[PDB]
């Protein structure tokens, strides 16, 4: 069912390397485009992922990268997903920087917010939402990728908030202080992602070290307004950064806000 026969996979092109190793573009039964994570030995806690894949198979939204299945009668496993031709949102922004109208930037934000509203409705946390974890297809559509996958990482520099790889600059204060994850820490990260989009892929808090960033946000300081963002757009991303998690809006509310502004600005 979810179990895919690796004999049905053709490996066509390498797409790069991530936290779990090499990812390739290929075909399933020679016809259907797919992306295949060829999990690297030692990079993932595969046993727990295989069980959690049973839940994740039921997460289906047009703005979520779709899990197609898993090859588990072999080790290490393969994770098969929808293919996104334009790759990482972060690189897409940086390459297409002067080619985007502001209306286009807001629709990208909307795409991600739709995905996250769906995950929120399923009480499913992303845990590492950022432009680097969003992909872009051949329609210029942004989809959210590798939601929930932080759980399975075997890399202390990534999983520890004091590690060199921990996504400090997307983390809400309660994540950094107490490792308290919730849909409200995903909301905080989404605000930073909106900032990345409107900054055409600039690194947030680029001048700061992770510890300087943690101190900065603890004191109530935030990110500045990218000039391509109107005050209406900036208000949306800024609302994501309330000190108190329970005062942050839900993705349902954010989506409504984004659609309001899309009407107003075009
Ligand atoms: C998700 C991913 C990773 N990253 C990870 O696997 C990863 C693992 C764990 C994490 C956590 C830390 C959160 C646990 C994060 C990420 C690394 C390499 C490739 C892909 C990937 C996936 N899919 C599903 C695609 O369609 C695709 N598509 C591409 C299409 C094109 C190109 C490309 O080479 N391009 C783009 C267009 O113009 C030419 C250059 C590259 C990738 N690229």
Author numbering: 394 to 659
Question: What does the primary publication say about this deposited structure?
Answer:
Btk is critical for the generation of calcium flux in response to receptor activation, because it activates phospholipase C-γ2 (PLC-γ2), which produces the second messengers diaceylglycerol (DAG) and inositol (1,4,5)-trisphosphate (IP3). Btk dysfunction is the cause of X-linked agammaglobulinemia, a severe disease of primary immunodeficiency. The Tec family kinases have a lipid-interaction module attached to the N terminus of a Src-like module (i.e., concatenation of an SH3 domain, an SH2 domain and a tyrosine kinase domain). The lipid-interaction module of the Tec kinases is an extended plekstrin homology (PH) domain fused to a Tec homology (TH) domain.
We replaced six residues in the activation loop of Btk with the corresponding ones in Itk, shown previously to stabilize the activation loop of the Btk kinase domain. The overall conformation of the kinase domain, as well as the specific conformation of the activation loop, is very similar in the two structures we have determined. We also determined the structure of the isolated Btk kinase domain with the six mutations described above and found by comparing it to wild-type Btk that the mutations do not introduce major perturbations in the structure. The kinase domain of Btk has low catalytic activity and autophosphorylates very slowly, like the c-Abl kinase domain and unlike those of the Src family. For example, there is no detectable change over 90 min in the level of phosphorylation of the Btk kinase domain at 4 μM concentration. IP6 has no effect on activation of the isolated kinase domain of Btk, suggesting that it is not a direct allosteric activator of the enzyme.
